[PDB]
Amino acid sequence: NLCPFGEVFNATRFASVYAWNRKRISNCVADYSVLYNSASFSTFKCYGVSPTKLNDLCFTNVYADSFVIRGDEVRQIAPGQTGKIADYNYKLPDDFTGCVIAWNSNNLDSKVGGNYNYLYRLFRKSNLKPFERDISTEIYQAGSTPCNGVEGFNCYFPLQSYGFQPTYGVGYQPYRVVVLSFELLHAPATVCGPKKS
Amino acid sequence: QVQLVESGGGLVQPGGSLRLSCAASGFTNDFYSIAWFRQAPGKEREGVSWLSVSDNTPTYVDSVKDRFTISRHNANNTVYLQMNMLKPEDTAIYYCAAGRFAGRDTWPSSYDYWGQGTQVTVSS
Amino acid sequence: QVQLVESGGGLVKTGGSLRLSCAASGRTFSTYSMGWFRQAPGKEREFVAGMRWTGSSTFYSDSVKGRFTVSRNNAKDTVYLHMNSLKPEDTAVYYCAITTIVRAYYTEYTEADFGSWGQGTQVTVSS
Ligand SMILES: *[C@@H]1O[C@H](CO)[C@@H](O)[C@H](O)[C@H]1NC(C)=O
Ligand SMILES: [Cl-]
């Protein structure tokens, strides 16, 4: 009974990072080493655990969070990072246990003339808490002066399109990201690595 | 506190061999990973090999697959890159880099710790 | 592409007021941000003012800020350009349009970002 990771990794379209998606995985066998050894992934980093240890553990639930960012932002998907993505879009806890997986999606997510579907949040009053998801669309008040519903000096719309084009440099090309996190409850532990099956 | 001490570079003919070393200190445990990046003239730093130290799992780009070997000696906390059947395209400054994670990344920006590069030249 | 039904405009004296309307059935204006543009003879079509799809943000070119206002009805199907303190320099063909492109800085919008253009309506301000 293999975990349906394909539904996440091979989805036709991914979420915008500000509106990142979460898939719950349960009641299945996960081969984390097979994922780790896939040449399809250019980023594969685990925190608080390794793929070998995950192959020998059972969890109640696994969460697969997925979204698109630009290449030069991939380094922000890690504990203790700063930047617009870590601060305002998708935040991992300092004590994160899990894995960050990423791959270049230029062939899927860029379009001649721009793919404007993918957004990120450029401004926020405070930093996100870990695993917080903010889909609000109020004017960002950058200074002490209220905006009163009008954009202008220090009054900005908080979301921004990437506009991915295939001729962008790699730092500006789209990357698909999957973050795996792990939950243990006082309940049957139905997601296991192959060694603990 | 974390320091990466690099050495082993120089000049060789095509087909020849070279052994680079990365001595890591300042880690409290084995939960870190090493990368080798190479920077050929007028290009970006490009990853060629990776070692996840806790799992002892190596990774290689397809172009160095059967020529390059990455390994660690526990005793001296040193990771080695054995480069055999060297070719002119392998000429570059070679960096080792470390991160506090189990795994691998193509992005130099994902590695917080860096050796001083060593020059590798393959010519006749 | 959607149909935007644009109306209003005409001849007004310097210092006077006009209202332009832009209507679209159902959820169009609550889905896509809208802009008002104008074009004088032999000049480029320039951004005037707009409203985010949210209905809670409006924004204005430096040429019209403090004189023009954008509003949207409760139904969210009709957007208005309230043109006050009109000057001869405001004489132009005015257009409404929508964009799928989200720019955090509205100051970066151009006509290339917009589509589903309304029919242009003449505004003439005479001294
Ligand atoms: C994604 O699809 C390819 C087939 O195109 C398959 O080889 C790969 O294993 C799939 N990924 C997952 C995690 O199932
Ligand atoms: Cl918008």
Author numbering:
A (entry chain EEE): 334 to 530
B (entry chain AAA): 1 to 124
C (entry chain FFF): 1 to 127
Paper quotes:
The RBD of SARS-CoV-2 is the immuno-dominant region of the virus spike protein and the target for neutralising antibodies generated either by vaccination or infection. We report four nanobodies (C5, H3, C1, F2) engineered as homotrimers with pmolar affinity for the receptor binding domain (RBD) of the SARS-CoV-2 spike protein. Crystal structures show C5 and H3 overlap the ACE2 epitope, whilst C1 and F2 bind to a different epitope.
C5 and H3 bound strongly to the Alpha variant albeit with reduced affinity compared to the Victoria strain however, no binding was detected to the Beta strain. Based on the structure, the H3 interaction would not be expected to be sensitive to the mutation (N501Y). The observation of the lower affinity of H3 for Alpha RBD is therefore surprising. In order to investigate this further the crystal structures of both H3 and C5 in complex with the Alpha RBD were determined. In neither the H3-RBD or H3-Alpha RBD complex is there any direct contact with residue 501. The crystal structures of these complexes do not reveal any differences in the nanobody RBD interface that result from the mutation. Molecular dynamics studies have identified that this mutation alters the dynamics of RBD and leads to an increase in affinity for ACE232. It may be that altered dynamics are responsible for modifying the binding of H3.
